[model samples]
Target: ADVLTELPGVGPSTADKLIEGGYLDFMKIATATIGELTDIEGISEKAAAKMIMAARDLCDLGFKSGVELLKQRQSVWRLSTGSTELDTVLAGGIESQSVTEFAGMFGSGKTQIMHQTCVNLQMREKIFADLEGVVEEELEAPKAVYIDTEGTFRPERVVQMAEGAGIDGQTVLDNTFVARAYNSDMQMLFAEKIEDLIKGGNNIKLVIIDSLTSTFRNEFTGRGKLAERQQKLGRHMATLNKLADLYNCIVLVTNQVAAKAEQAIGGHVVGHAATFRFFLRKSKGDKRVAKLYDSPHLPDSEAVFRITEKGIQD
Candidate 1:
């Protein structure tokens, strides 16, 4: 934390106020618009510009060597998906500050995996991050934000999974905040307002949008509306990504798939925006395959796991 009062227009009192609001984060200042800054009392356009410029300068906005960059990335946390094999393929688990989507047809266990994640997120203490002996920053077992579309969230499911994970069944449901969306607009609104909830002192660690495309796919039905649907979806994903980067949280979006010839994928549009895309297919009863379809750091890999009455297992 540098001296905010050192900036030309931000005096001691103003600096205290900004710091009180937790607005001193360099990225917050860097990404803030002038209009946003001007909303503060006594902060003029020119003053906002100086503050933004100062934040830009204070933070490392320059290029770094590859080795140095790699070293710097150690702070990013990875969350376990409750299966060792799945975690291995994910290079740890679900990555922070990115969206990992699960795509599959009906009964492919998309929602089941969603519920599994909610419980597994509570299993944070068991993930052994000390493997590299880096004295890793222990993660807080924080609340999860679940935005349910397609009427997918079930309370009993969470209870069973939480009990299976050997924790208090009630506490698991207590920490997870669930909201249902009636339409695409409500879904987008929830996405936007979740930041406000976090800022208001909710310790949200993971954001889940189960079946991300259901509302839009149902409302904007058919190829004629495809372009607009994709455009709106793109904006939705952008906001989700922004929240992830701001809060250093993981976002998991489950999706329904449509068969394209012999292969299955997310409906013509929503697949491309995801950071990591996984294609889930049922193999046998209670057994399934999760294939990593798109990723920059991962390869075309697969992991097999089963979904029991308790939850997902290796």
Candidate 2:
């Protein structure tokens, strides 16, 4: 678990899979050969240099001043999900500085929640940007980026949600940038470009990845291939985390539930990479439950929110 923070390419879930699969210690993962590493999934040798550097940086024991750490909390930013109850569970709303992971069964409304946040981040910036009296080109009207692996992103749905919130449908659709990624490679490529899009002048406030680990889970089958999957997954996660931190934006990713048990979720490598994790469940009616299962700075909790044609509601 310590390796997660120590090694950029290693995450709690990834370590979990390795340790559970018999990877013994940090050296097992860190000292793995290029041939061995490449055998694992996600190790594009073209980008192997960075991943290799990540491997070499696997451990560094350092500490931050408690006072400075506490001071950092004062600047944390939040965005309303348009659901008071769920926002309460999140201690304000979706945070804008880290990766947030969500896992749930299909039709459990994970994508719905993502769409709601994409809509909320726009309005959230709108109300706050004017008060600050500080404006930049793209900051005047912040936007969101959603990478869809499930091919479920529909601008029409987002338009409907935006109009329900008293905003122009066309404007919201025009502002929101969405792209489809068929596999892990495409997803990783698009993530790198998102940072460029920001530097090239897109004030991206949020990024959503639907089915964060889909292609890997679908394509890499059997226990024999699990090690490669985790390696690639950990690197993809690190890349995503770096992209979010580089822009100071919030990244929300959805995952399908594991088949092991009803409550067993987030198959491993990608789970621990998230700063905060929620397990979403479908309740009776439109009501859904969001369980705060993981966080470095929040308590364990749960909240009830409803998914409506208008977005997330109490």
Candidate 3:
């Protein structure tokens, strides 16, 4: 019972052959010689004993199904950072249980805006109520989980921005968790672990992936791998969506641009799974322009914000 000796491998016929033979237990089968196993009918000499060896290795590692480890996720609502212009474009500022994609070229205000949101979410609950003109019971500060793939997240910068925004620097830092992911698989693994953290006691309000497509764009190249790449990217987006819905937290992803000659216009992957897609591009000097590229309820619109040492400026 320590190992799964009864599981079928190679084929049902091969399994039957093993059963008919003397090697009934996985441990016994694991120790059986290839010559002895091959004497059984339907068992191939090449794969005769290797299947049991694989099973033994798996048992040694304590591999188990992920079913029992599953935990229920909490629901959350979207909260804006008090940017009226950007909020309007984002359908009242990033809906809860949804994924928002922010895409643009280099020097855009994508990372700046993300940092601003982190600062804004740390405000006193009453402050947000006052800004939103909504009367409710006492509000609790929301937590945020940020996955930085492109090294765009600087805690010192966030601290400075929080201080300038009149937020408690210590509170902001305490509520925010940052993880730097270097590859797509690492990013996915981090995202998967977020639900467990939230369930354990972190009041995670938002999940942000800065520059979602960087690793994919770098690791997967050429038109030959386009389909596989897109499929993988789609799965990654779906994972974010599931996390948003399950945790009731807003998921925000940053993306890079890609030229497309087929469409006669450049395109990006922001529209595939994002509930709201905003395109940020450099405009006139050091300023950045943000346009509502796609949304469920909002029409096409634009907003301009400046990035400075403090944070994103309106």
Candidate 4:
């Protein structure tokens, strides 16, 4: 039997409509809103409601048993940030299936870290070859999708970092897919395109939006437009969260700081959507400090590292 037809209330006609509307899986329909579903032609509020309810009923939505949860946790993996101290502070490194936020002022090394992560994801064997005594599990080198909203993504920086890790620059560059997003709408659209890459069998293990809030900050201003800004930001974060979990990849976003407010921009919408938040601040010379302000399991702590010509370091 066809998968969409398995939903009790959905016939072949409705299934074709759902597919046309881009509801390819039960989980997508399960998590969709009635308003969103009704946007598709011929799907009424009651039909949308029935579809969502049926989809949710047929999919995994409730709490899992402790043993079952533990088993699922075993699939979780980490991607190194290319700085040993920073990785240690993160309890390993950037985790899969969640959003990690890096917020800071200019010259705080957020973009540098993003570049370093993409390079490191390419040459794991060379990067970890220094460990002399232990056997490491061998896995395929993962690909990354970089969404550059500020044009801060530099191939020269990635090359220098990859060379620092003892690998050729071309190999890293070939594996990392980079997209330039000129505005907020383009930024969100690029992220949505990543879901298509995964569906097309690309093993995209990392997705980075360097400077996530700048476009939104400039496009929307004044108290009158704040509500609309937040609503759009909230929706963007929702799409990002869905993309990360659906493909089991890491989603990293860098945000800007508000000097007067002494906090990250996008207000509480960004704050709550991010699973882990790190506040980066510049120190004297090439040094920078990262404070793990919020995390589900990790303690509050800070780590100091340097942004050198080679990228993030001890």
Candidate 5:
């Protein structure tokens, strides 16, 4: 049954075009802007406008009571960062159903924490299986999608982390999907494509974008282009946050710092979009400081951790 055709102004052909353009459900269409809808091959401004309205009408797009939202929050879960102090600061771990940004300068162990989460995610999967009495074989190996925008993802490091966690390195390596993004568009496209992979039957639990602003930093230069750059970055963050909520997966994005400003780049757009923001700074020896500068529920505090031969640890 083609439910899409039920929308006003959408026939079979229109429905197919919508699906092809990645509007897989009414919720997607309902959330889309007029410009986004018109990007489809045959969807005109008027047609798209009508279809969007109809989609919004069919979807549960409304505010909810606090208790209702609280019940929904029950589905939210956290994955350990393999550092007890760090996890304690986070009140548990890197949480799912939200975006968590790690912003810092070079050599701040931002990427190290991302890789550690990759291995620790598999450990979280075991807990779910154990609690639910589900046969391990019956369920797919828990997966993660790593978007490496800065070309810093090392498979060997992931393997080392996996071994440190007493999990099979090869299995973790195989289950952890990695994609390299050469440009901002490619990076954003990979973020959107994760939903397709999930629908295609991968039990992905985490999404990491190491250095989220690198491509944007490269392409959109100069003070004049700041508006355009922030707009695009906002859209990218919106897509990532949507994926986090819709799929109930952890979204971890690393950010770089500006030398002059001595702060995280992308400004308020990136800062407000993320549910949690940690400012990482290198300290003495292997130690790195993570400040929970922003979080919805957690208090602002600092945690001390280190990048060891195994992985990120307290």
Candidate 6:
């Protein structure tokens, strides 16, 4: 009952209406009739129905016990694919059940990080043995789905970086599946289609959407389109989260920043779908500075990493 009001579109008025309509808790609210909800004061029929549908869709209420919830949460942990330094900052690394957003201006190493991750995941068991102590011998070379909306994904660069990282160049290229997303709709459709790829036996460990906001920002400019843009952005983020959960793969999304003259916030989308947020900016030279902006359990802090011919360096 207490948490019911906290759901999106559910306020005090709506909560009362839902309660009067025989929904005593969040679980019941999922099944409450739209007409009955509208019968409550101050709730329109459309809004009432929308809330019920949203709750059912967004927050699945089928689980009956806390243990089931924990198991579901555990299923999401398989997607994290980052170095120790970056993973620790992200509370066990990039969550497979959530979206991790990297936001920055141009030349901030966003694309480089994505490329590095691709190469890193393709490294042989011996490489991981030297680095993380455990070898990935039992697991097959993980697959990666790269959704390039900004034309930044380069197979040649991935091969070069993989060679530099001491992994086989051909192995890196062999495991990656690339999709070019031209517009916002394509970007969304690409993200939504990731689960099918995973379900079709692609062992995909990562989903990289380079520059999630570029198409939206370019298509929707000015304050007039702000609401519409945000709504679309929100749905895109939700889709990322859903894919992450369903496939147990890390969702790494890069975003562009819009200057906010009125307030101090630089990236608005940072707070939307991301379970963790990293802000990357160019340093004095070829190096990059990565700052932790938001995390579920980590303090807001900063770290310096580099992008070289070899790839991302800690």
Task: Indicate the TM-score of model 3.
Answer: 0.68
- Between candidates 1 and 5, the one scoring higher on TM-score is 1
TM-score of 4: 0.82
Which parts of model 6 have CA positions greater than 4 angstroms off?
A: 1-84, 124-141, 261-270
Error of 1 at 161 (Å): 0.8
lDDT of 3 by residue, 1-314 (tens): 31233554645556656656644445546546788877887677667757767656643535445652332111234466445677666645667678877777767777877887888777654122332322233235578888999888888878899878877778788889998999989888888888667546566777889878888877777778877677777778878887676445678878777565111011234355787777788888767777886777678999776777667766
The local distance difference test score of model 5 is 0.83
Better of 3 and 6 by lDDT: 6
Candidate 1 overall lDDT versus native:
0.78
lDDT of 3: 0.68
Flag regions of model 4 displaced more than 4 Å: 1-26, 29-61, 125-141
- How large an RMSD does model 4 have? 4.9
What lDDT does each candidate get? 0.78, 0.71, 0.68, 0.83, 0.83, 0.70
- Point out the worst 10-residue segment of candidate 1 by lDDT: 129-138
Per-residue CA lDDT of model 4 for 1-314, tens digit only, reads 12899997999999988887767778788889999999999999999999899888887577789787766665566777877777888778888779999999888988988998888887664233212321243235568999999888899989998898877889889889999999999999998888677556567888999988999999997778999999999999998988877666789999889876468898989988999998999899999999999989999889999998778888
lDDT string for model 5 (115-151, tens) is 9888887774423322232344433467899999989
Q: What is the Å distance of residue 135 in model 5 from its true position?
A: 14
In candidate 4, how many clashes are counted? 0
* Residue 308 Cα positional deviation in candidate 6, in Å, after optimal superposition: 1.0
Ranking by TM-score: 1, 4, 5, 2, 6, 3
**Which regions of candidate 5 fall more than 4 Å away from where they truly are?**
1-26, 29-63, 125-140
Best by TM-score: 1
| Candidate 2 lDDT, 46-121, residue by residue in tens | 4344445665555332365877566455435677877787788888777766888878887778899888777776
Give candidate 1's total backbone clashes.
Answer: 0
Q: What TM-score, over all chains together, does every model reach? A: 0.87, 0.74, 0.68, 0.82, 0.82, 0.70
Best-first order by lDDT:
4, 5, 1, 2, 6, 3
Better candidate number, 3 or 4, judged by TM-score: 4
* Candidate 6 lDDT tens digits, 57-119: 656756458776555554444322334466556655556556777878878888988887787
